[PDB]
Structure 1
Amino acid sequence: TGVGKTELARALAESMFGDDDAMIRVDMSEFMEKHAVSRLVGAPPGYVGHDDGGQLTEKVRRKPYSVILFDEIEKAHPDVFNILLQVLDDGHLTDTKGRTVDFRNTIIIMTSNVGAQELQDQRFAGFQDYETIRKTMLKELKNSFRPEFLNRVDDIIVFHKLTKEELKEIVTMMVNKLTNRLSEQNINIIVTDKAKDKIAEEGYDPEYGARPLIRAIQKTIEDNLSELILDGNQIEGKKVTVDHDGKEFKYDIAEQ
């Protein structure tokens, strides 16, 4: 969790289309029931909602060149994935009305974390590397899915756990995004390297990825800035420098 599986899909969508919105996202955590498969292809003839058609089929017909994201595939019922067998083999999906929808100009991304917890709760009771980790996670993926489904997939990719330096770079990216967002509200923010390192070290938690970074950014930068904004509005049209002398974060107000 918190490694970048969904962020990579959003980044690809933005690179191909200019926005993360222009991505057909299917959250499979709402397909835990087998009968939820109707949401993809529509209700059979003679049943309510038949004229509405399939949501995924209509969206793909409306935009044949798109990125399709099936987020958290392991959350769905096992049989729901048989609907994707035809898509991965011929790029075709037939609507309930009988209309064949073309998927041959789409990128299909499926995200999962099966086995990821198993590598953390594994405890050897008797007295690692990338290869063994990928081997055991691939084995768990084989256990969780049928061989024919995994056989149609072009690539199975193992997302490695983030390191300290990569976490620091992620902190830099988050700080840059926050600064660019606050500049619109006329709030200039500069966060020094020592402050970013202290945020990274304080929000370090190896098995949670980069979400503790988000929580740390919130609790360290956003709360104090919100207090300054609400305390008589002493930030507007000014520049705030966030420093860490060595014991606590210091916030200094100056002019542009």
Structure 2
Amino acid sequence: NTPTLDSLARDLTVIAKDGTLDPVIGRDKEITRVIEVLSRRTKNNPVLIGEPGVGKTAIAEGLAQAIVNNEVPETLKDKRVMSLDMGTVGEFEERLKKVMEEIQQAGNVILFIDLILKPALARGELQCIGATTLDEYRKNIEKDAALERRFQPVQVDEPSVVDTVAILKGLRDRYEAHHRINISDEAIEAAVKLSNRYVSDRFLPDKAIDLIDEASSKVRLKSHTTPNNLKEIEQEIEKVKNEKDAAVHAQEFENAANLRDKQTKLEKQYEEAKNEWKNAQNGMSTSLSEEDIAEVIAGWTGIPLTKINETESEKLLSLEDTLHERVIGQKDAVNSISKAVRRARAGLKDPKRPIGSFIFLGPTGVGKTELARALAESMFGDDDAMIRVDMSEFMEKHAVSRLVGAPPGYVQLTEKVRRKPYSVILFDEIEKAHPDVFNILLQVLDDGHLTDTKGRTVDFRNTIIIMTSNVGAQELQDQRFAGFGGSSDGQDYETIRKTMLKELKNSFRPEFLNRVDDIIVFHKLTKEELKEIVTMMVNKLTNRLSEQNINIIVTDKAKDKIAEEGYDPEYGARPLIRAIQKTIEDNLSELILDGNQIEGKKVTVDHDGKEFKYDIAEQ
């Protein structure tokens, strides 16, 4: 009965026979893989290759389950799966010498490690299932010829979202019978969708079973409280008992009869109220709706409940209106990308290719940076969920191994994108990057995924790839001054697109631009366009001062006066930012610093031609 192995390892068939743990559900496609390799004459030692967290432990648990269920074949029939624990461990090799002898003699024990023993593998008398990671599989196992010809690589990947739905349905009985919460069918598919959408650091299905546990308990604990019916009488029971103690030790038995009768009477009414309250609770069903699922995930990432509750139905229809809130002018660029993005999300193109693939051409500081930030907020609801990588530091050839991953043997973009799959990737000065970098960039547009040096494959199907190139801006700014008294803003967008397309491919590869859906070219900022930008900044301060309750209104005369002072078409909106800070913020701060001179009132700023006049009036 291999007594030595029973003291230095943990048996799996004992747990499976007892049934005290949750059986593995959904891993039926991996149990047959393990037994298939074990039946081979050579290379009959499969290795569970994958990142720790996908559920490789459940692979061994499921294998032992087949013995009890009589699903294993005759060859593997009447066998016990044994897993060695590395936490218990020259003198070290003394213990394992007797353990390995019993495995071969018994002939029915299947070794399971999580990595003396290499010569044992060459004999073929031991059937061990390794659990080394992919990074260490090509570093220590592949380098050894003997181990390469004895271990069969087996890939364990994350199961599909639809597959996880069936996993949760299997554990429905164990959850409903425990939390006493009637779990709805619709909540199963909604919870797994939300868990994968936000959380990506745990994969599936560990983030789908613990999500429903807290949501179901949230309504279970809420419905198990006193509805202002029993707590009031419960305190009355305690206080009367205190009165009785004074009717005995004080030798005053005249009041003892009254307190005794009242105490018993209150017990009858308290019990009746408690009994009738639980009868109604049992009749009603406290079902778990999809609303409570979003509440738990709301506090984990900080996303408001309103954003999570969105069904993502009318958001794409009014995309042009949404993007115009933070971007003023250049409406053609807004509509060009709005129609392009809605095709990929629906599924009209290849899902593996990035949803967003556009090239930005125009002057610097004109508002291109502002437009890029609008995509992250309008799509994912998080402004900081935008990974921006600049090519200023990637000019040399030595930076090729930086954004893709450090080579093995030493101490960026691929690592960051994994933690935030739903992010916008922005590139700055792509025209001044090393040519070898474009080889990796092209693979994203065509294949859709990249692999680092450790072998882990990250996904780019939920990322928007935008490369902002400053080339061709000289031609764009020459058209504005080409004609006196007018500009090229009246020209059709198609005419500008064709003229600038030739210059775009002049310095770039021809076939590279073919994968880009639409080319986006910005415009210039005129007098009236900058006036509205000033309005945005003023309203931003008013919204930010909601705590102080300050109503800030700026006259149109002052808007024009401040617009012309910082008017600089070469840069754009950058000079206006300095002008607003040195004119509005300088005096606004002083009023607050003067013992909150303005509070719950209306402040108007008007320009009389020479200076700015401030008027203080009630709201």
Q: Deviations over 1:15-74 (max 9, x none)?
A: 1121211122222223222222322221222333xxxxxx22222222333322223323
Instruction: Check 1:227–1:142 CA distance in 2 against 1; reply closer, same or farther (3 A cut).
Output: same
Q: How many residues align?
A: 250
Instruction: Check 1:242–1:140 CA distance in 2 against 1; reply closer, same or farther (3 A cut).
Output: same
Report the alpha carbon displacement of residue 116 of structure 1 after superposing the two structures with TM: 0.9
1:29 partner SS: coil
Q: Residue 394 of structure 2 contacts residue 400 of structure 2 at CA under 8 Å; is this kept in 1?
A: yes
Give the corresponding residue for 2:492: 129
Question: What are the residue-to-residue correspondences of 1:72-87 with 2, within 5 Å?
Answer: 72-87=429-444
Q: Please, what TM-score do these two structures have when normalized by structure 2?
A: 0.37
Structure 2 residue 582 is the aligned partner of structure 1 residue 219? yes
Q: Residue 182 of structure 1 contacts residue 189 of structure 1 at CA under 8 Å; is this kept in 2?
A: no
Q: Deviations over 1:211-230 (max 9, x none)?
A: 22212212221223234444
Question: What are the residue-to-residue correspondences of 1:31-42 with 2, within 5 Å?
Answer: 31-42=394-405
> Equivalents in 1 of 2:479, 2:526: separation in Å?
21
> Equivalents in 2 of 1:30, 1:184: separation in Å?
42
Report the alpha carbon displacement of residue 89 of structure 1 after superposing the two structures with TM: 0.7
Instruction: Check 1:125–1:113 CA distance in 2 against 1; reply closer, same or farther (3 A cut).
Output: closer
Instruction: Check 1:230–1:125 CA distance in 2 against 1; reply closer, same or farther (3 A cut).
Output: closer
Give structure 2 stretches of 5+ with no counterpart.
1-363, 485-490
More moved, 169-178 vs 139-148: 139-148
2:436 partner SS: helix
Q: Residue 385 of structure 2 contacts residue 420 of structure 2 at CA under 8 Å; is this kept in 1?
A: no
Q: Residue 6 of structure 1 contacts residue 71 of structure 1 at CA under 8 Å; is this kept in 2?
A: no
> Equivalents in 2 of 1:235, 1:77: separation in Å?
55
> Equivalents in 2 of 1:76, 1:250: separation in Å?
51
Q: Residue 114 of structure 1 contacts residue 137 of structure 1 at CA under 8 Å; is this kept in 2?
A: no
Report the alpha carbon displacement of residue 95 of structure 1 after superposing the two structures with TM: 0.9
> Equivalents in 1 of 2:393, 2:557: separation in Å?
43
Instruction: Check 1:75–1:251 CA distance in 2 against 1; reply closer, same or farther (3 A cut).
Output: farther
> Equivalents in 2 of 1:130, 1:186: separation in Å?
44
Q: Residue 414 of structure 2 contacts residue 458 of structure 2 at CA under 8 Å; is this kept in 1?
A: yes
Give the corresponding residue for 1:139: 502
Q: Deviations over 1:139-172 (max 9, x none)?
A: 3322332223222222211111123322222221
1:239 partner SS: strand
Instruction: Check 1:125–1:60 CA distance in 2 against 1; reply closer, same or farther (3 A cut).
Output: closer
Q: Residue 242 of structure 1 contacts residue 251 of structure 1 at CA under 8 Å; is this kept in 2?
A: yes
Q: Residue 23 of structure 1 contacts residue 69 of structure 1 at CA under 8 Å; is this kept in 2?
A: yes
Report the alpha carbon displacement of residue 205 of structure 1 after superposing the two structures with TM: 1.6
Report the alpha carbon displacement of residue 249 of structure 1 after superposing the two structures with TM: 1.4
More moved, 10-19 vs 101-110: 101-110
Report the alpha carbon displacement of residue 185 of structure 1 after superposing the two structures with TM: 4.2
Report the alpha carbon displacement of residue 201 of structure 1 after superposing the two structures with TM: 2.6
More moved, 7-16 vs 27-36: 27-36
More moved, 223-232 vs 152-161: 223-232
> Equivalents in 2 of 1:180, 1:126: separation in Å?
41
Instruction: Check 1:122–1:180 CA distance in 2 against 1; reply closer, same or farther (3 A cut).
Output: closer
Instruction: Check 1:109–1:64 CA distance in 2 against 1; reply closer, same or farther (3 A cut).
Output: same
Give structure 1 stretches of 5+ with no counterpart.
49-54
Structure number with the bigger relative contact order (C-alpha 8 A, sep ≥ 6) is 1
Instruction: Check 1:122–1:200 CA distance in 2 against 1; reply closer, same or farther (3 A cut).
Output: closer
More moved, 240-249 vs 72-81: 72-81
Report the alpha carbon displacement of residue 133 of structure 1 after superposing the two structures with TM: 5.3
Instruction: Check 1:125–1:172 CA distance in 2 against 1; reply closer, same or farther (3 A cut).
Output: closer
Report the alpha carbon displacement of residue 192 of structure 1 after superposing the two structures with TM: 1.6
Q: Residue 194 of structure 1 contacts residue 244 of structure 1 at CA under 8 Å; is this kept in 2?
A: yes
Q: Residue 385 of structure 2 contacts residue 423 of structure 2 at CA under 8 Å; is this kept in 1?
A: yes
> Equivalents in 2 of 1:15, 1:129: separation in Å?
27
2:402 partner SS: helix
Q: Residue 116 of structure 1 contacts residue 137 of structure 1 at CA under 8 Å; is this kept in 2?
A: no
> Equivalents in 2 of 1:188, 1:126: separation in Å?
43
Q: Deviations over 1:75-116 (max 9, x none)?
A: 433332221010011112121122222212221112122121
Report the alpha carbon displacement of residue 254 of structure 1 after superposing the two structures with TM: 2.8
> Equivalents in 1 of 2:606, 2:495: separation in Å?
42
> Equivalents in 1 of 2:548, 2:555: separation in Å?
21
Q: Which of 192, 197, 200 is equivalent to 2:563? A: 200
Instruction: Check 1:187–1:38 CA distance in 2 against 1; reply closer, same or farther (3 A cut).
Output: farther
Q: Alignment RMSD, CA only?
A: 3.1
More moved, 159-168 vs 228-237: 228-237
> Equivalents in 2 of 1:173, 1:125: separation in Å?
31
> Equivalents in 2 of 1:200, 1:123: separation in Å?
20
More moved, 245-254 vs 119-128: 119-128
Instruction: Check 1:238–1:29 CA distance in 2 against 1; reply closer, same or farther (3 A cut).
Output: farther
Instruction: Check 1:124–1:205 CA distance in 2 against 1; reply closer, same or farther (3 A cut).
Output: closer
2:403 partner SS: helix
Report the alpha carbon displacement of residue 123 of structure 1 after superposing the two structures with TM: 12
Q: Which of 518, 522, 539 is equivalent to 1:176? A: 539
Give the corresponding residue for 1:4: 367
> Equivalents in 2 of 1:125, 1:116: separation in Å?
14
Give the corresponding residue for 1:149: 512
Q: Deviations over 1:171-214 (max 9, x none)?
A: 21122112212333444322122211222232222222122221
Give the corresponding residue for 1:51: none
Percent identity among equivalent residues?
Answer: 100
1:140 partner SS: helix
1:78 partner SS: coil
Q: Residue 91 of structure 1 contacts residue 104 of structure 1 at CA under 8 Å; is this kept in 2?
A: yes
Report the alpha carbon displacement of residue 2 of structure 1 after superposing the two structures with TM: 2.3
Instruction: Check 1:125–1:117 CA distance in 2 against 1; reply closer, same or farther (3 A cut).
Output: closer
> Equivalents in 1 of 2:494, 2:386: separation in Å?
32
More moved, 8-17 vs 176-185: 176-185
Q: Which of 98, 105, 109 is equivalent to 2:466? A: 109
> Equivalents in 1 of 2:469, 2:505: separation in Å?
12
1:157 partner SS: strand
2:534 partner SS: helix
Q: Please, what TM-score do these two structures have when normalized by structure 1?
A: 0.83
Instruction: Check 1:124–1:110 CA distance in 2 against 1; reply closer, same or farther (3 A cut).
Output: closer
- Report the structure number with the largest CA radius of gyration: 2
1:204 partner SS: coil
Report the alpha carbon displacement of residue 233 of structure 1 after superposing the two structures with TM: 5.2
More moved, 140-149 vs 15-24: 140-149
